[PDB]
Amino acid sequence: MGKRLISQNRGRGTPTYRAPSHKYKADLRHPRVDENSSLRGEVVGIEHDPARSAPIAKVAFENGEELFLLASEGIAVGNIIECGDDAEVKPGNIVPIGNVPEGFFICNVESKPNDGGKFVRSSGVYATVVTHEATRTAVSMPSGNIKWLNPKCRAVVGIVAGSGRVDRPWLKAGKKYHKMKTRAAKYPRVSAVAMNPRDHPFGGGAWKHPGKPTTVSRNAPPGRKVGLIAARRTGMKR
RNA sequence: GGUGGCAAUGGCUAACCUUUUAUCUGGGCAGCCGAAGCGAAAGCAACAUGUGCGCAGCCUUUUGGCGAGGCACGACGUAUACAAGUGCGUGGAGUCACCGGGGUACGACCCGAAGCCGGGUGAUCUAGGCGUGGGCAGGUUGAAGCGUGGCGAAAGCUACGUGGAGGACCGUAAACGGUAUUGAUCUGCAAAUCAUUCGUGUGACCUGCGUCUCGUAGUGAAAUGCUAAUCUAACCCGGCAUCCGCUGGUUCCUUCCGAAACAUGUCGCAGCAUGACCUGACUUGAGAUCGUCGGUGGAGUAGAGCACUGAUUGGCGAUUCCGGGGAUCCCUCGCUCGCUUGUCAAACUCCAAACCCCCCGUCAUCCUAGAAAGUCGGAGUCCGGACUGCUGGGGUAAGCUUGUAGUCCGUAAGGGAGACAACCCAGCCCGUGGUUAAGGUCCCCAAGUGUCGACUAAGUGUUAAUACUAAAGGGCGU
RNA sequence: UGGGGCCCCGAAAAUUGACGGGGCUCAAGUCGACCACCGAUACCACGGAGUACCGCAAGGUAAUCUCGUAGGAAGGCGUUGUGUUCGGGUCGAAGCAGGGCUGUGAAGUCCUGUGGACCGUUCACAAACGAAAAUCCUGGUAAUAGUAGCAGCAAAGCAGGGUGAGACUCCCUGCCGCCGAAGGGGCCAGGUUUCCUCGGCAAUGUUCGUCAGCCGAGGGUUAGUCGGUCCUAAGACGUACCGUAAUUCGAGUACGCCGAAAGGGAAACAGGUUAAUAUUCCUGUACCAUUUAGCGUUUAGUCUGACGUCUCAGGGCAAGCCGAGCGGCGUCGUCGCGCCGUCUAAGCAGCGAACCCCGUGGAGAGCCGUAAUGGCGAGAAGCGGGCGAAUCUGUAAUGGCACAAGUCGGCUUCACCCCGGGACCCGUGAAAAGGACAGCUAAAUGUCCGUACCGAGAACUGACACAGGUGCCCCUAGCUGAAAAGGCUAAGGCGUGUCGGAGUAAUUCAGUUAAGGGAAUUCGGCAAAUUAGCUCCGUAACUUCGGGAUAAGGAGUGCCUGCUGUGUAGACAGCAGGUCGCAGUGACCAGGGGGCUCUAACUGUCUAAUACCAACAUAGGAGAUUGCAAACCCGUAAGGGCUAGUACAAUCUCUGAAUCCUGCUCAGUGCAGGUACCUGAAACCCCGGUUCAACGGGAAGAAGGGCCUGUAAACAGCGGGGGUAGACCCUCUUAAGGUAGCGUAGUACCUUGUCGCUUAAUUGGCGACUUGCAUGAAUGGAUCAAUGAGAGCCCUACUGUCCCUAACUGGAGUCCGGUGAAGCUUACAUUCUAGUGCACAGUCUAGAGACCUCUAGGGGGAAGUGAAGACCCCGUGGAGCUUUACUGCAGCCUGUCGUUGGGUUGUGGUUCUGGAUGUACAGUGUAGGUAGGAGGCAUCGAAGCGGGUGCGCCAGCAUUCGUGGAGCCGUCCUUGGGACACUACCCUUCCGGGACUACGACCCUAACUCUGAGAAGAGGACCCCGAUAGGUGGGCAGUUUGCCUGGGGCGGGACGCCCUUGAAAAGAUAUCAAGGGCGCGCAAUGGUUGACUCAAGCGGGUCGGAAACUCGCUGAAGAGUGCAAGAGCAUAAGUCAGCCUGACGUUAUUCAGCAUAGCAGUGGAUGACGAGACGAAAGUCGGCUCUAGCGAACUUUUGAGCCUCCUUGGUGGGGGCCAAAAAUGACAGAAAAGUUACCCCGGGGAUAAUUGAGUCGUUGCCGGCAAGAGUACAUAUCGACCCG
Ligand SMILES: [Mg+2]
Ligand SMILES: [Mg+2]
Ligand SMILES: [Mg+2]
Ligand SMILES: [Mg+2]
Ligand SMILES: [Mg+2]
Ligand SMILES: [Mg+2]
Ligand SMILES: [Mg+2]
Ligand SMILES: [Mg+2]
Ligand SMILES: [Mg+2]
Ligand SMILES: [Mg+2]
Ligand SMILES: [Mg+2]
Ligand SMILES: [Mg+2]
Ligand SMILES: [Mg+2]
Ligand SMILES: [Mg+2]
Ligand SMILES: [Mg+2]
Ligand SMILES: [Mg+2]
Ligand SMILES: [Mg+2]
Ligand SMILES: [Mg+2]
Ligand SMILES: [Mg+2]
Ligand SMILES: [Mg+2]
Ligand SMILES: [Mg+2]
Ligand SMILES: [Mg+2]
Ligand SMILES: [Mg+2]
Ligand SMILES: [Mg+2]
Ligand SMILES: [Mg+2]
Ligand SMILES: [Mg+2]
C-alpha cells in the first residue's frame, strides 16, 4: 500500500487539517422568526470577523437577544433593521425574494425556507433577481448560473461588504502565511511530480514529468482522482 | 531379516471385568489377517496330482534304480463379448510376538537469516497542528506622510528640515545553524565531540511548559527524511523448534570385503529418481570363459589409387556446335570431347591391412569346500584429474576445451629421481638373517679418480619422460 | 662434389644464484661396448599373529590370503541404573598425582603419597551412555605488559608553622595566580538525604591521602499572609443514548468532571536566634477572609479581571557618580592621597502629572499647539471646578553599628514602575472564578500537603566525579570603548576543567619571525598573509529608477597650554599655539578589492551521524470540479473532516519574480458529450420439454463497448533521400513535418571542430561561425538589475604555497616515582637467494649467512589487524515499486426484488357479454361452427326492406323499431371450402373489455427524508438502506517472469523428430562440431495383372532452324521413383492400359526409442481370427521402395452394445466399460510481465572486473635470401615478396 494522499488525511480529521474553531467570533445566520412575525432592531457596533476577512454587524433585537449578522455594504451603527414578511425594500432589511423587484441586488440567500442563508456570502459578491413566476423565482448566482428558488425565501438586500479584497497582491510568502494560520488549509504545498511513487500517482522517475495523462475520469476510485477531475476541456483559449 | 509359540479342527484378541494398588491369574469371539479368484459392474466360480527331467538322501553289480522339495508341461476358473489368442488365478501355510534394518508423516541427528501473519506498546528523542508564557547587546540606511522656501504664466519642477517603514544592512562563543580546514581525536571528553574560519540574528524568527496526530498508519517547504542510538513498512510477545536442494558440526577399539565421479527422465544443471558399479543373506545344482591355437563369418579404418562423384597440371588431335574476338559469319577460337604428362579428397573407392566382434573345436584356468542363473535387505555415487597411444575434433597457441583404449591419483606405503598427487622399481601383518630391482659408484653420499676405441676446446656439456630443454641460415672449425 | 659426428656464429631483461652444490678438460663431458661392487618392506629362509575354507574333535590346506577413502558386515571395551549370584571397607571406600605389569587395542589390575565413607562382581536387561574441533556455550586464566592512558578546550603554585605512625596532595598566615554580563547570586524540572556533627580509610577518587558528594553512628525541614489548594484555555475522562456477532471497542448529543508550582489570583514587613530551619520560631508593628451577636441597607445593572507587533514624549525610582564635614584602615625613599562607613521595612495619614467631564468664553483675508501626527462656530485660545499615578512628606522610631561616627547637598538613571500619543494588518491579538458599587463594632475560627541540600566542567540525563545536552532560564560593580564586544580590576567563588619530578635527542600538536624572488607550488591561491575604527572629499558600467555603494580612490587622527559655539543640564561640536616618537583606531578590537561568464529571481527549507546545492518552497500565470441534502474524503455502522465555511469560496493539478512572447498536429492513449445503428447479464413474459422441475430456444434491452463530435497551459509528436546560385517544384508525406529564438551548450558522438582577445607557451575562459549523433516555446523559450558559505576564468595587493629551508616558544615524546588496561595468538621461529609446490614459502630442496641480551627510531615484509564482500554469479530465497503481465478484492455506475401507498389515463391479453355472428358456385336460408348429411317451429308469429338490427356481399336466417301479413325440412341440400331445421352458439367472434396483474408519463399525501425546542415548513413513494446481476477498477492483495551458455547479458535454440561425416574397419562415444531437413501433399501421385524400357549421343527426313515429331544404331542405368541425405530397384520398386479400394474390423509376441542395462506414447517386423481385390495358379496387397511428417492423466463430444443410481417397480436425468476427435513446439505435458545505484539474506574462486601463472594471434625489437633504387655500383644509404 503506497501511502494515502493528502485528501484522505483531511478525511480522517487529524489536527493538522482541522480548522482552529476557537478563533472564530460566531456563526452567521438569519434571525429565527415564527409565522406572521416581524421583529426589529438597531445596530450596536461594526466588528471584524476573522473567519471571512470581512466586517460583521452586532444587532440588539427588541426581545433582548443580540446576534452577529453578515454585514452588507453601507451598514452603519445606529440604523434599525426590520427583518420579517412586512419589511420594505431598503439596503439592510431582510425580506422574501418573492416580493423583491426585478433588478435589485440581494445576498445571503437561503436554499429552503428558514435555513439562515447559504449563498452569496464572501466579500463583495452579490446576486440578482431575474424573473418572478407564480411558483419560483430565478436569481443569477455570482458564479454565473440560474437558480430556481422558492418565493418564500429570505435574503438581505444589498451586496456583501469588503469588496475588492483581491486587488492587492500578496508579493510575499509571509503575508499569505499569516492568512493561513486562521484557516484549515495547509501552507505550503508540495507538488506531486516531486514526490516518490509511494506518495502520489505522479511521483517518481529520473526527471519530473507526470508520465500519465492528468485528466482523470469521474469514476476513478478514491486515492486516484488527482489532476483534472473529469474535465470537459483543457488549455487556454486560442 | 535372527529367534520363538500355535497351526486349516487356523492365529491373535481390543475396550472392559476379576486388580486384592498400576504388576499379576482367569475371562472377554466384537473384530482383524488366512482360507478363491476374475471383472468397471451385473455376475460367474478352478488340479486335494495327468506327464517328463532330476539335486539331496536311500538301495545297488559303483553302474544303474526309487526320488520329498525344484524346474518344465498338460488341464481348468474368469475378463477381453462374435471368434482366436493372451492377461490374471488354480494341486491347503498362515498368524501373533520379541530383538534388528529401512521407507513415509509429524520438530525428526544439532545449530545457522532476511522475511510473512495475529494481538498489544511508544510523539521524554524527532516531525507537524493548537493553548499559554519568555527572548533578541550595540550601531547603519532613511520609504510614505508633514513644515518652510526657490523656479513657473497654469499644469508642473525642485533644495533643506522633521518622520521612522522594511520576510532592509553590519554584528556578539545571547540564541539558532553547520560552509572550509577534507585540522585535533578516531579501543575518543563524546556509539558524532573539539578548535579556528563561517550563515541567520524584528521575523515564512528562536524557545519553556501543556495538549493532540502512529504502523500498509502518522508527520514531512519531499531526502524514502523522521516516528526513543532501529525505518523502501517501528518495537514487544505469539504462530515458531517456520522453511531451504545452501554453509559449519556429529564423541570407543579391532576384524572381513570395498566403489562411482557415468547413461536416460526431470522448470534439470550446487538437487532427485531408475540403471551400471559395492556389500549381506538365501534358493538351485554343473558347468563358465579373463587367455592361446585352427576354422566358418562381419568388415570399409590405415595405406594405396583414379574404376564412380567432385576437383587438378601442361603437350597433342578435334569438338566443324552450346561460345568471346571484329554480307560469304572473310578466319581468328576460350568452354568441351579423346591420347599422353603432374597433383588431390573428412562427407570419393576398382582395391585393401594390423587391432577388434559373434560362433565351433582344442589347450589352459576356475568349480560339488558350489559354475551359471534367480530372490530379498543396506548403501554410497551422477564437481573429477593426470600419463602413454589415436597425425583424435576445435582453436594462432595454451599447465586451453571436448572425445576415446589402457593404467593410475582420488583411496597407495616403501626405494630412486634436488624437492615432485598421478614418472621408474614395487602394491604393505610383526621380528631377525641373506640376495637383488630401479638407480648409481671424484667429495657432499654407500659403492670405480674402473677397462677398451674414438670425439669435443665451447665450462659446450655435466637435464629418461617431462606443462621445466631455442629456430631458419651459415662455417677454407675439426 | 655429395653424405655424416661434435662444436662455433645467429643468441638481449630486469634483487645476487643455480649442472642439486663443490668442481671437472687423453674428463668427473659425448658416442659404442664391457667388468666388479653398492642399493627396498621386492625375492629366499626361520619364528610369531590373524584370517578364509574343511574336519566330531585333535587338527589340516593357503605360489594361487594380509593396501585402502565413501560405504556394507562381524566381534569386543567403557559410563550410569534394574533383576539376580558371590563379596570388599575406619587394620581405611570413592576420587586425585605419579609409577610397575598385562592386552594388537578400546582398557584392566597392583604399588606409593593424599583422602575420611562408601564400592564392586556372575548371568541378563536398559539408556537423559564415550568429544579435539561447531567465527561452539558457561566459568577460570595467559601473552601483549609494568606497556597505552592519567597533555591539546581554563600551562599554578611557593615559603613558614601545625596535625599525624606516615604529608607535593589535609589545616592556618604571607606572597603569586584563575573566572569576573560567567566558573558569581535566585530557582524550575529532575535527584532523593547528597545537608550538619563525630569516628574511620579494605574498596570508590584516573597518583597519595590523616581528606572526601566514600564507609559507620547520631541529628536536622515548624506557615491564615510563601506556593499548591481555587478559576478556566487547548484538550482529556466518566454516566446515559445509539452502533458492533461482542467487548475493555466506535463518532456525535445531553449532563457532569478534570486540565497551568511561568495564564487570572484576599491578605506581612524589619531584626534576632541554630551546627544544620526560617517572609514559618522569637520581639515589635500590622493586615485579610468565613461564622455568631448587635446596629443599618442595595444602583442590580454596569465596570474591572481583560489582553497584539513596532515606535515615541513626560514623570518617578533601585543601581551608579561628584563635593563638604565626621570615624576607621592603608601608604609614608618624597608627597598627601586612596579605600570603607556615615543606615531604617511594611502599615497608617496627607498631596497629586497626563487623559477625561462640567460652567463660562466668543476665534478666520486666520489663530492655537506637538518630538511627531494635528484642533477649531457640530465652538479654538483663555478663565474656573470635578474624578484621577507611580513616587514623595510625616509617623512606625527604636532596631541594628567597633552605643565609632550616625550631618548634608548635587548629577545621572537603565534593563524597573506609572501615564499618554502615533503607525500597521486579505494577521484583529483568550476565557472564567474573583473584585467595586453598604457597610460599622465585638469575640471566636483559618483544616490539608511542600519546606533540608544540588540545580550542574562532581549532586540532573548520556553505563562514569563524561569537554555533550537540560539552564544562559532570570539577574549582575569600576576604567577603556557605540557597547552586556575584547582587555585590565572589585564583591563572590576557587588553585579539583584531581598525577608529580628532571630539563637532553629524533619526531609530533599549536604558535612567533624570516634575506632575494613573489603562485614559479597544486586538480584548484587549499592553507596563511594583506585590509580593518571614526571624520572629510570622491564615487563607474548597468538598472525593474528602488539600487549598485562601505563602489573604486585619496587626506586627517597622539600629548600639553588657552579657548569658542549649541543646550535647562548631562554632554556634544569646533578652533589657535607648543611638542615627542621609526610608528598616534600605537595594545585589544577591527572588510582585501576589481572584471567576464553559467545557474537559481529574492528572504526561507533539506538527507539528526560522509551530500546546505542548480534540489524543495515561494509570490506571479493558467487549467479543472462543485449552487451546499454540492465537489473531494474518513467509518463495518452509528456518524463525521473540510465547516462557526458558500464561487473575490473550498478542493485538485501544471508552471515558477519582472520584461519580450508562447507556433503547427485530435492519427495513438486519456477525458467529455451524443448513444441513428451493432453488441450487451439476471429477473419478468412467450414456446418446447418435464404426470412437477432441472434444461433448450425466442422476444425485449439497462450501464459499458463499437461508431460519431470536441478537447494540446490534457499525456504527447513536430520525418526521410536524391533534382536545382542549400534553396525550392516533387517526394518518403501510414495526423503534421519546427514559428520567434538559441546553438560545439550543465545538451555536440566525431572533438583538443575553425578563427579572434587573453599568455614565452593554454584539451582552459570569453567572442564569432554552426550541416543541431540527440535544441525549442507553461515536458515553458530567450534575456535579466539586486541577492549567493553555488560553479569556472582573468587583473591588482599580499604573502614560507614554493625556490630551500632555518632559528625560537608552550604541550606530548625521550629519562625517573605512583597507578594501571585492551585488541591479532595451532606450534616453533636469528634470516637471505633461487627452485619447487593449488602457478605469490621464515619452516620443503640446494646453497649463503648468523655469538646472546637490551634501549631508541621510522614503518619495508609477516599476501599485518579490524569484518562470514557492498563488485559479478547462483538460490524453482525475500522486500519495496511500476504496468495494456496472470488471478482476485474494495470503491463507483446501472437492471431486478423488498421497504411501498391512493388516483389520471395509453397499453395488451387476462377475463365477459348483444349474434353462430358461420355470407363468394348468393340465398326460397346466414355453412343456426362442426353436426345422428337431417324434420321441429309458423296470424296458436313467419318473409323479402329501411340510416340498413347482431353482422355481412345496404342480400337476409331473427321477429327486433317496423314492413308486408310465411321463412317451413331439404329425400328441390344455393346437391356444399363449410349445405345449412328448434332443448343449444361447448367453440370464426363480439370484444363497456369492466376485471388482479406488468409497462411509459402525470397528480395526491398518510408512510419515509431534511430543517426547527416545538407549531410548522420543504421534498415524497423518488432517495437512502438490505439482497442479487452486469460493467469499470494497479485504489489494494497474493503470485509468476524457465533453461542452455568457454562468467552473466545480447545473439541464437545444438529445447521434439529424420539422414551423412566427426567416430579411431563389432557395438558405444562430447562440444553454441560440419552438411542439412521436417511439423506436409495425393481417389490417385494407392492395390493387382498384362505389355514394354529409360538418360545421352550418332545417321536421315519439309523454314518442324543449331528449339519440336518420327525411323535405325550404341546404351547395367549415366533416367524415374511427391519433398532433405543416404541406401534399393531392369522381363523391375520405373512407363502405359484393364479391373479394383488391403488408405479393412479384432488380437499376440519380439526389436528400437532406451548397445551392454531400468524408463510412456508409439512405430516396425513377424504372426492369428473374420471378410475381400487382382490373377490360370503361385502369389501380392495392413497406403504412396526403406529410414521424418507428431503428444500422458483429468475433461467434453461422437459410435456399437451392455452394467448401474442406496426397501421395491416405472418415467426424466446422471455414473461406468471399449474405441475416435479436440493440446500441452519449454514437444516425458505450471492457467503467468518488469525494475532496484534505496535494496536485504544464504553461499560461490563450483563463475566474472584485475594482481599473479600459461600462450603470443596482435604489439615492440631483430635475422635469412637479396628483387630494385642509389648518374655506372644490391650491400655509403634505403629495402620489396617470401621465410625464421
Ligand atoms: Mg501508485
Ligand atoms: Mg462384439
Ligand atoms: Mg533625514
Ligand atoms: Mg548578520
Ligand atoms: Mg518470533
Ligand atoms: Mg588416407
Ligand atoms: Mg548426491
Ligand atoms: Mg601411468
Ligand atoms: Mg589405486
Ligand atoms: Mg613415494
Ligand atoms: Mg569406512
Ligand atoms: Mg573440551
Ligand atoms: Mg580577568
Ligand atoms: Mg587510591
Ligand atoms: Mg482544578
Ligand atoms: Mg608529565
Ligand atoms: Mg536560491
Ligand atoms: Mg523547483
Ligand atoms: Mg504550446
Ligand atoms: Mg590554471
Ligand atoms: Mg534451479
Ligand atoms: Mg502488485
Ligand atoms: Mg505464500
Ligand atoms: Mg543461467
Ligand atoms: Mg531516490
Ligand atoms: Mg551477502
Swiss-Prot record:
Function: One of the primary rRNA binding proteins. Required for association of the 30S and 50S subunits to form the 70S ribosome, for tRNA binding and peptide bond formation. It has been suggested to have peptidyltransferase activity; this is somewhat controversial. Makes several contacts with the 16S rRNA in the 70S ribosome.
Protein keywords: Ribonucleoprotein, Ribosomal protein, RNA-binding, rRNA-binding
Name of the encoding gene: rpl2
Keyword Ribonucleoprotein: yes
Region (Disordered): 1-22, 202-223
Name of the protein described by the UniProt record: Large ribosomal subunit protein uL2
Subunit note: Part of the 50S ribosomal subunit. Forms a bridge to the 30S subunit in the 70S ribosome.
GO molecular function, one term: rRNA binding
Superkingdom in the source lineage: Archaea
